[PDB]
């Protein structure tokens, strides 16, 4: 009856392997930069996400799998990693390790939103963090690292997008501006936008429908960029300077609306055309102050996170495939009932250095050979009355048909030199 809940799925075969390759590569580039692996629990006290992600965001307001611990305390299934990483930084007094403290991990994230192509309820993302410094070099580095992770995978058609939100103050002022300009024309907005106009109006910029877009154009709504505080623009230029020097092709966006409210200054996202909607492979930005929201000292930080699934789609789109599932090195086929147990014993002697499988019932040579082929076995091994009594085994390389009769002892050696 039961099925895997909509939005989640079982990972196996090629799909699983691709995920493992993605994380493998990310592990290399990130750790090369001095990043330390740190894995946080699947759930945190609900507050860590409420206060951190911001009580006004969609995530916090209606996309968090939150439940109560038996007795008391409200816990929530981690929807994003940053807040957690900061929580960990505080808890372990990482503030005393040599700065900056770079952390990374790869794991599942849970968002209670209606699934569609690209939007899963349970997805997996690689997360990078650089805590303890305001220096714009880390911001550039963050962007470069994300860019490299996808680059190393073989992806070529990426679109990097940089921008800044200035700061909470600048953010507030832009919002007020949008309200003053849009409110008198409120009646021309899409129902969706009309709501967004109340809390965090910026969203109306990144909304759909022609109604909104045409209006924004005629009204001559000026970019968030024009509202950046000076020091903010200085910092952003530093980042650009570094990116340009490192030859990282990017496009400066008029405004990047990131789904999380803890962002301050730097904001970026890498996209891929070959995905349709949800072209965002990954995203990130600076988030100073978050630590304080969780009740800790001021700890500056930058970082990113990319969806492994999205990246997988991108790779597939660009014609990147994976090679066939390897079969057993040897598949033992019992010709007599007494042989089945003996096949098992032989198999165990070959393991784990050699992958040896066997049938659990006696069968005709042709049939067992059929199954060995059916399992992509390199060698087929026959165990009948003759070999059992002789303490030998009849091996047969399936690719050529070459057959050899040898003692049980030689089998490991023969197979290894013939396949290694």
Is there binding between residue 39 and a second copy (CB under 8 A)?
Answer: yes
CA 75 to each of CA 60, 65, 71, 389: distance values in angstroms, whole numbers, following the listed order? 13, 9, 12, 64
**Cβ at position 169, least distance to ligand HAM in Å:** 20
Residue 176 CB coordination number (10 Å)? 12
Count CB neighbours of 56 within 10 A.
Answer: 12
Name which of residues 350 to 379 contact a second copy (CB under 8 A).
351-357, 360-361, 371, 374-375
By C-beta, is 282 or 362 nearer to ligand HAM?
282
For a second copy, the closer CB: 282 or 368: 368
Rounded to whole angstroms, how far apart are CA atoms 363 and 374?
Answer: 15
- Rounded distance between C-alpha atoms, residue 105 and residue 125, angstroms: 8
Nearest residue (CB) to a second copy, 31 versus 402: 31
Residue 341 interacts with a second copy (CB under 8 A)?
A: yes
Q: Does 77 bind a second copy (CB under 8 A)?
A: yes
How far is the C-alpha of 395 from the C-alpha of 382, rounded, in Å? 6
Q: Among a second copy, ligand HAM, none, what binds residue 245 when CB lies within 5 to 8 Å by partner kind?
A: a second copy
Q: Nearest CA to 189 among 205, 176, 177?
A: 205
The 3 state secondary structure assigned to 159-192 is: EEEEEECCCHHHHHHHHHHHHHHHHHHHHHCCHH
* Residue 280's binding partner out of a second copy, ligand HAM, none, with CB under 5 to 8 Å set by partner kind: ligand HAM
Find which of ligand HAM, a second copy, none residue 70 binds, CB within 5 to 8 Å per kind.
a second copy
Helix orientation angle between 410-419 and 337-350, rounded to the nearest 10 degrees: 60
Q: Which does 303 bind (CB under 5 to 8 A by kind): ligand HAM, a second copy, none?
A: ligand HAM
Position 36 contacts a second copy (CB under 8 A) = yes
- Per the CB < 8 A criterion, the answer to whether 79 and 262 are in contact is no
Given 119, 135, 406, 414, the residue binding a second copy (CB under 8 A): 135
Distance, in Å, from the CA atom of 363 to the CA atom of 359, rounded to the nearest integer, reads: 9
Q: Is 234 in the site for a second copy (CB under 8 A)?
A: no
Nearest 5 degrees, angle CA 200-CA 202-CA 203?
85
CB of 85 to ligand HAM, least distance (A): 7
- Residue 129 interacts with, from ligand HAM, a second copy, none (CB under 5-8 Å by kind): ligand HAM
* 344 binds a second copy, rule: CB under 8 A: yes
State which of residues 95, 112, 233, 408 lies at the interface with a second copy (CB under 8 A): 112
Burial class (CB in 10 A: 0-12, 13-18, 19+), 316: middle
Shortest distance (Å) from residue 119 CB to ligand HAM:
4
Which residues lie near ligand HAM (CB under 6 A)?
80-82, 111, 113, 118-120, 123, 125, 127, 129, 259-260, 280-285, 287, 303-307, 309-310
Strands 266-271 and 250-252: unpaired
The partner in contact with residue 3, picked from ligand HAM, a second copy, none with C-beta cut-offs of 5 to 8 angstroms by kind, is a second copy
Q: Is 141 in the site for a second copy (CB under 8 A)?
A: yes
> Exactly one of 148, 212, 240, 261 binds a second copy (CB under 8 A); which one?
148
**Which residue number places its CB atom closest to ligand HAM?**
307
Asked whether 379 and 395 are in contact (CB, 8 A), the reply is yes
């Amino acid at each position: 009856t039961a099925r895997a809940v909509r939005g989640t799925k079982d990972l196996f075969g090629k799909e699983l392997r691709m995920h493992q390759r993605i994380v493998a590569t990310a592990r290399k580039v990130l750790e090369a930069a001095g990043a330390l692996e740190l894995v946080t629990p699947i759930f945190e006290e609900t507050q860590v996400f409420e206060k951190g992600v911001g009580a006004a965001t969609d995530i916090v307001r209606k996309e968090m799998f939150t439940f109560q611990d038996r007795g008391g305390r409200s816990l929530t299934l981690r929807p994003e990693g940053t807040a957690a990483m900061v929580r960990a930084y505080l808890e372990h007094g990482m503030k005393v390790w040599p700065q900056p403290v770079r952390l990374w991990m790869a794991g599942p994230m849970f968002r209670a939103e209606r699934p569609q192509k690209g939007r899963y309820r349970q997805f997996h993302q690689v997360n990078y963090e650089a805590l303890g410094s305001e220096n714009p070099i880390l911001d550039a580095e963050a962007v470069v690292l994300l860019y490299e992770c996808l680059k190393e995978l073989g992806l070529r058609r990426l679109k990097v997008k940089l921008s800044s939100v200035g700061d909470p103050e600048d953010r507030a002022r832009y919002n007020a501006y949008l309200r003053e300009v849009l409110s008198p024309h409120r009646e021309a907005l899409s129902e969706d936008s009309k709501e967004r106009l109340e809390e965090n109006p910026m969203r109306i910029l990144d909304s759909k429908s022609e109604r909104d877009q045409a209006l924004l154009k005629e009204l001559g709504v000026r970019p968030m960029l024009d509202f950046l505080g000076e020091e903010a623009r200085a910092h952003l230029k530093e980042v650009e300077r570094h990116l340009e020097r490192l030859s990282v092709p990017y496009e400066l966006e008029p405004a990047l609306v990131r789904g999380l409210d803890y962002y301050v200054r730097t904001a970026f996202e890498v996209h891929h055309e070959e995905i349709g909607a949800q072209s965002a492979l990954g995203g990130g930005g600076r988030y100073d102050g978050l630590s304080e929201l969780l009740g800790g000292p001021r700890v500056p930080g930058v970082g990113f996170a990319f969806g492994v699934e999205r990246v997988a789609l991108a790779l597939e789109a660009e014609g990147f495939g994976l090679p066939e599932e390897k079969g057993p090195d040897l598949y033992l086929i019992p010709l007599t009932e007494e042989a089945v147990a003996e096949a098992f014993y032989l198999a165990e002697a070959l393991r784990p250095r050699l992958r040896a499988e066997y049938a659990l019932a006696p069968r005709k040579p042709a049939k067992g050979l059929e199954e060995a082929l059916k399992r992509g076995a390199a060698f087929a091994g026959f165990l009948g009355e003759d070999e059992l009594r002789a303490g030998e085994v009849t091996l047969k390389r399936l690719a050529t048909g070459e057959q050899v009769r040898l003692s049980r002892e030689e089998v490991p050696g023969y197979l290894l030199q013939a396949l290694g």
